[PDB]
Design a binder for this molecule. Structure first.
Ligand SMILES: O=C(O)CCCC(=O)O
Ligand SMILES: O=C(O)CCCC(=O)O
Lengths: 545, 533
């Protein structure tokens, strides 16, 4: 008789969250305008949350509205090391019960949270993302609603269905895999540029039975706290995700110094990821187990045009990739490679369309294509690149090039032509609305493809525009490791959960493919149980007779 | 569609026993000169080494050599030049090489790989069979299946776009570093990554060289192209230093000591700025595994299962039982039975005497380490040797099975991995079983295997909960050793490693870095959006 009895596993039907249109007179447009008004002139005081306790430290910080930095949208504080360690202790004390909860019960929290975000909370998270991170309507919509909702629903499906992955049983024994959470706590460290990423970085490990210290991005605090509150309201128990904004170095020092660290789920700069990686290595003898580091780290992404390309698609897809959300995406196109034969046509269209791009206040004017960049630091960096484009003999500014930080961190979309395919601006991630173009002779398309592949340290996203099948096949083979998300006749941004799992290798990170069915596997440490139902025999074997 | 390879019985007059006997005779008095292989080139260096037969160390079963820094760097370059074409091969075509190798190992080469594992690593017939045949064959067949099926894992496509995932090999080379104790593990450490489109420098274990090279040659004969796996025995630190110094390192597939894995981890971290991508480290690092007995246990099963787990292959398994917890009420039975069966265990030459239960330990270094523990057992106030404890390295590295009782559940012998035929027993008061379960969990730094023996359902349920993280491979009424591919994926956390569960369907995921391709079949619209108008 079987002493361990394993319950049958269920399945989950989910689909991508539909993108809304926000047409005039539509309910979502009116709801959004109301949610935007709800934020005008408001400052939210956002505490650290440990368990259910709201905690304040002396390290007071402000989040500013990028397009109106006079507006402090949130006042928050950095957790001190004492509070971080207390958060660790409380999370650890909550972990066993949470890990032992059926996967389906944990998933229900995220499915509930996804419905809330889909419906009654949509306008709120969109508005907080627009005002706090400077996103336009459609950029907030694909992010804080659609992607976050998809993460929560698809990850719940992947997780529930994962328990159906079971080993073979042969008499006289029954074999079962238990998908245990990691023993210890996970540190989640999220970036400013996507509300959805913060929710996934903290949420996915929690779904798999982990407990988490979540350090949200300073410049995305407003929307991040909104998401945190929704998770708790959806039924996430206390001490499963601790909401602990903190000084970055301080946070990293603290979590990497704890013997109970079992994972870091990170999205941000290469240098910071490498630094955490080395801190873990330094402390390796202290940990109860080997921590798992996951990092997504940015790119220098390309659109490559072949002479057979559809010109109109090249222009609109490049404009979107390069300039949406001010080019502040790890996936944004920042290098465009154009054949000489098409350059007159493409150049003309790009400059014409450029003149029609409206940069302004995304809350007050829905005609805005994109708005201010995130903060003074980003503004200063981008300014230095525009200045480099002027001084450099290999570079010439074809359009834009101006910026003004008197009201918001405003930067014109800028199009640069480089005569040098190895110019530093062709190599280094700017994270601003700065597109560099290199024109290559048609008969050197193959040599140029090799340049696309070899010029930068990154491997995140890239697109090929071509109507020639042989060329598409050739280019796809050549560029296999130049992009983890590769596009044929479409723009290099806008990966959708369950359709284009996102991530790339080289300097771009560990490529764990959040948005795909395998991502959750990083956050479980499986145990296999074999129950044998018959007495064992002798210790000897018959051949020994 | 694959199933597990049958374990043969090797009965008198059977085809397999006749074939194995011939294969053993084929190796008697033989020394194979095993070169480094880079591509198809057989390379010798001046750094000559020998592999000795553990039970007869006068027999040099192989002469090989250590690849120097320069040779290793040459092997990296050659492998890297072969990687693109190998990775571009359809998954099915790479799989075919491993399925052919599996069929070879199953049939015409079975006796050879078994004999080489017996003579070279000191395994008995059945230990070689479950290892060099069954487990290796199963790795190759199951990973092939998993990988082929992985290509069927594809994302959602919505018109007018088609999405496809390409399971790329990792860009760079993978270093595979395998242990002496399982022929199959070497085959998997180098084989699994190669299957997924990687190129590999394989540093096989000195003390398993003969069988490892046998596997290497089978892979080549089965159609593995030149420069996909380089066969590069080497000094450990030299190999580690060289591979972690290359900008092209993309993975380390390691099975061996905790401190060495930690060292490699730290070398990678120190050199992080040099690498083209973040290397993936995978490590399986041993355990201090338990058999916990409840008063309701079947004593016969406890005795036979514990004897096998503790002493098979001289206890030289990362999964071997080395701490046994017994309730006072059952101790007189279990002690009496353990001591009686002990006196019947045959230690000797496994080639010449199939009556042998287990043979010599792997080498002089192992013999010395194990003897230090026996000497500790003779010194410690809380330890008493109940049986065994003898050892003699005059002819082979022979260590008798040893049964020790500890009065201290926290004694270093209860905590530290010996990798020898040394079983320590702790007797607990029946009414303190719960406190004792907690001690099972908290005493050691490891989390690999464990067994509970009990016939009471509530006890089994309670124990399972409490030991959830004490064991990655957990057994109810069965021994802690002998995981079978596709049935009990193997590995554990805590200090026991990264727990990537080789033997299961997810292991190959560590050795692929997926790419997603989206093709859009209609021209793109305007860059503007309707809501902006
Ligand atoms: O910037 C990021 O980190 C996410 C980009 C995702 C995408 O555009 O596909
Ligand atoms: O010792 C090892 O490294 C493998 C042990 C596998 C098992 O016995 O389950």
């Amino acid at each position: 008789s079987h002493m361990l009895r394993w319950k049958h596993t269920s399945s989950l039907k989910v689909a991508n969250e539909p993108i809304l249109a926000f047409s005039q007179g539509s309910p979502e447009r009116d709801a959004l305008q109301k949610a935007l008004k709800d934020l005008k002139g408001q400052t939210e005081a956002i505490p650290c949350v440990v368990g259910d306790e709201e905690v304040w430290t002396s390290d007071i910080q402000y989040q500013l509205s990028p397009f109106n930095h006079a507006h402090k949208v949130a006042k928050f504080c950095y957790a001190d090391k004492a509070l971080l360690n207390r958060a660790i202790d409380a999370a650890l004390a909550a972990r066993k019960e949470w890990d032992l909860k059926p996967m389906a019960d944990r998933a229900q929290v995220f499915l509930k949270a996804a419905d809330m975000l889909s419906g009654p909370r949509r306008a709120e998270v969109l508005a907080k993302t627009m005002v706090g991170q400077g996103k336009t309507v459609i950029q907030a919509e694909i992010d804080a609603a659609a992607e976050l909702i998809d993460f929560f629903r698809f990850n719940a499906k992947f997780a529930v269905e994962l328990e159906g992955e079971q080993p073979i049983s042969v008499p006289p024994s029954t074999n079962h895999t238990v998908y245990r959470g990691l023993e210890g706590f996970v540190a989640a460290i999220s970036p400013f540029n996507f509300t959805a990423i913060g929710g996934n970085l903290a949420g996915a490990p929690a779904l798999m039975g982990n407990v988490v210290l979540w350090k949200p991005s300073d410049t995305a605090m407003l929307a991040s706290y909104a998401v945190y509150r929704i998770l708790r309201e959806a039924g996430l128990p206390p001490n499963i995700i601790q909401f602990v904004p903190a000084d970055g170095p301080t946070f990293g020092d603290t979590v990497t110094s704890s013997e109970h660290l079992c994972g870091i789920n990170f999205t941000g700069s290469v240098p910071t990821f490498k630094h955490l990686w080395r801190q873990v290595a330094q402390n390796l003898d202290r940990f109860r187990t080997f921590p798992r580091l996951a990092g997504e780290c940015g790119g220098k992404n390309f659109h490559f045009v072949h002479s057979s390309a559809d010109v109109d698609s090249v222009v609109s897809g490049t404009l979107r990739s390069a300039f949406e959300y001010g080019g502040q995406k790890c996936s944004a196109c920042s290098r465009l490679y154009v054949p000489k034969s098409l350059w007159p046509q493409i150049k003309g269209r790009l400059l014409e369309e450029h003149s029609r791009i409206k940069v302004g206040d995304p809350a007050e004017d829905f005609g805005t294509f994109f708005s201010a960049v995130i903060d003074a630091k980003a503004f200063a960096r981008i300014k230095k690149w525009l200045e480099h484009a002027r001084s450099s003999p290999s570079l010439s500014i074809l359009a834009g090039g101006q910026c003004n930080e008197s009201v918001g961190y405003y930067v014109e979309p800028c199009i640069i032509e480089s005569k040098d395919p190895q110019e530093p601006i062709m190599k280094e991630e700017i994270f601003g609305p700065v597109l560099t173009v290199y024109v290559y002779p048609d008969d050197k398309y193959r040599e140029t493809l090799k340049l696309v592949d070899s010029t930068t340290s990154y491997g995140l996203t890239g697109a090929v525009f071509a109507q020639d099948k042989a060329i598409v096949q050739e280019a796809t083979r050549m560029l296999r490791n130049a992009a983890g998300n590769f596009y044929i006749n479409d723009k290099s941004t806008g990966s959708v959960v369950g359709q284009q799992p996102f991530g790339g290798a080289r300097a771009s990170g560990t490529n764990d493919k959040p948005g795909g069915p395998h991502y959750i596997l990083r956050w479980t440490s499986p145990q296999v149980i074999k129950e044998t139902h018959k007495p064992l025999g002798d210790w000897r074997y018959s051949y020994m007779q």
